[PDB]
Amino acid sequence: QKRMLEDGVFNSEKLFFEIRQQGYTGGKTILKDYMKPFRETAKKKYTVRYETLPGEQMQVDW
DNA sequence: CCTTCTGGGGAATTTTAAACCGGCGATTTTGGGGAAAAAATAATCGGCCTTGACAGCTGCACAGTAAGAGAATTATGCAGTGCTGCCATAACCATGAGTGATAACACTGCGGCCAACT
Ligand SMILES: [Mg+2]
């Protein structure tokens, strides 16, 4: 967590290689699963559609 | 002309079939304890499938509001000086109490002297 939140490392291979020296012996799946929430949420592509009521909304832009 | 046979009906009795209720023998069910197996849940493992990024980099422009940095100005608090009055302290004498001092013995610290090694 310190690595992710202060060094900005999100490479599962790098973190796995680091902690393996510390003593970890398991696989990378648990690491990826634990680290997934910290990763940034990629923007969606689905786009909701809305139909405003008559004489109820207007939009402005430059 | 008469006698005997037979048939119907009411009353008494007997037997067998049916239904209920109780008693007796058997299985079931509930509870607790111990063992074994199944399944559920969580964690860990390997690997496949798919796609994002890496391609010079990001600083600036405008919009509005607010903050702040520097300089000038103003307000105020401290300080300085003079004169007068009041309170504190200090100076002396007396008496009591505490501590520094003095005597004596014992233990320890420091300086002078002797010897051993390089
Ligand atoms: Mg716009």
Curated annotation (Swiss-Prot):
Belongs to the transposase IS21/IS408/IS1162 family. Involved in the transposition of the insertion sequence. This is Putative transposase for insertion sequence element IS5376. It comes from the Bacteria.
